[PDB]
């Protein structure tokens, strides 16, 4: 029997034996996270996760992976959000993310909560996921900023959002990317990611080495010179910090 490994540009991968139709279908298929250690092992159909259990990729021999199931009952499955449903299990955290980041009071004055690293990692490390409901750019761009605190463009046709009350960890903790605060000197970036549970979303990836307990920040990238109106389209707190920065140094 032959084994196929399909790596996504983000570092994650699908591995297992394919059927006659050459499809990733069976009870022994697995999605392996970017650390090439954490995995979701179980039932998949044509590469789509039906029932994946947390496991650890122990070793690989001639392309053949050996997994060891983690103790526990938590199960995961493809659960792509819609414009109204963010998740079937809002309180089930992502296992990879749970070992890399945590939420706490931000070190940035009056910035509420922030996202912090649990471990020291090197450059280009995926740390968190930015899942949320999927809505149009027209809907987002047509409403008050008060409702767009957590909106992130996925692509030309979709915007990901984490609307109230899901912006509270007590109501939603499946992903935590929306908890990272803004910085004009960020240590992370938002990057494309294909997640076995959340589907196509964005992730938070480090730009360089980060230490344990260091706050993770990303440049929100709001339009500073929007064509059609001489005024940076962004919330007040952003415009304030922007001026302070452009004057800082």
């Amino acid at each position: 029997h032959g084994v196929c490994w399909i790596y996504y540009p983000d570092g994650g991968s699908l591995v297992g034996e394919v059927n006659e139709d050459g499809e990733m279908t069976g009870e022994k298929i697995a999605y392996v996270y970017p650390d090439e250690r954490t995995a979701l092992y179980g039932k998949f159909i044509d590469g789509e996760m039906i029932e994946g259990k947390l496991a650890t990729l122990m070793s690989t021999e001639e392309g053949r992976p050996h997994f060891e199931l983690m103790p526990g009952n938590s199960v995961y499955h493809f659960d792509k959000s819609t414009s109204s449903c963010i998740s079937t299990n809002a309180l089930l955290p992502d296992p990879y993310e749970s070992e890399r980041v945590y939420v706490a009071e931000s070190l940035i004055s009056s910035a509420g909560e922030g996202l912090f690293s649990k471990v020291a990692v090197g450059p280009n490390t995926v740390m968190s996921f930015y899942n949320g409901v999927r809505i149009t750019h027209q809907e987002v761009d047509s409403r008050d900023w008060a409702l767009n605190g957590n909106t992130l463009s996925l692509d030309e046709e979709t915007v990901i959002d984490v609307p109230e009350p899901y912006n509270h960890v007590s109501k939603y903790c499946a992903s935590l990317g929306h908890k990272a605060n803004h910085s004009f000197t960020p240590n992370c970036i938002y990057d494309m990611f294909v997640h076995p549970r959340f589907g196509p979303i964005k992730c938070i990836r480090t730009l360089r080495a980060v230490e344990a307990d260091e706050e993770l920040t990303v440049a929100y990238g709001y339009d500073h010179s929007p064509p059609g109106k001489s005024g940076p389209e962004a919330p007040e707190w952003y415009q304030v910090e922007l001026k302070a920065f452009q004057a800082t140094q």
Binding site: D141, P226, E233
Partner: peptide, 8 residues
């Protein structure tokens, strides 16, 4: 003026 979401 139009875009009101993260990422530049």
């Amino acid at each position: 003026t139009p875009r009101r979401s993260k990422s530049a």
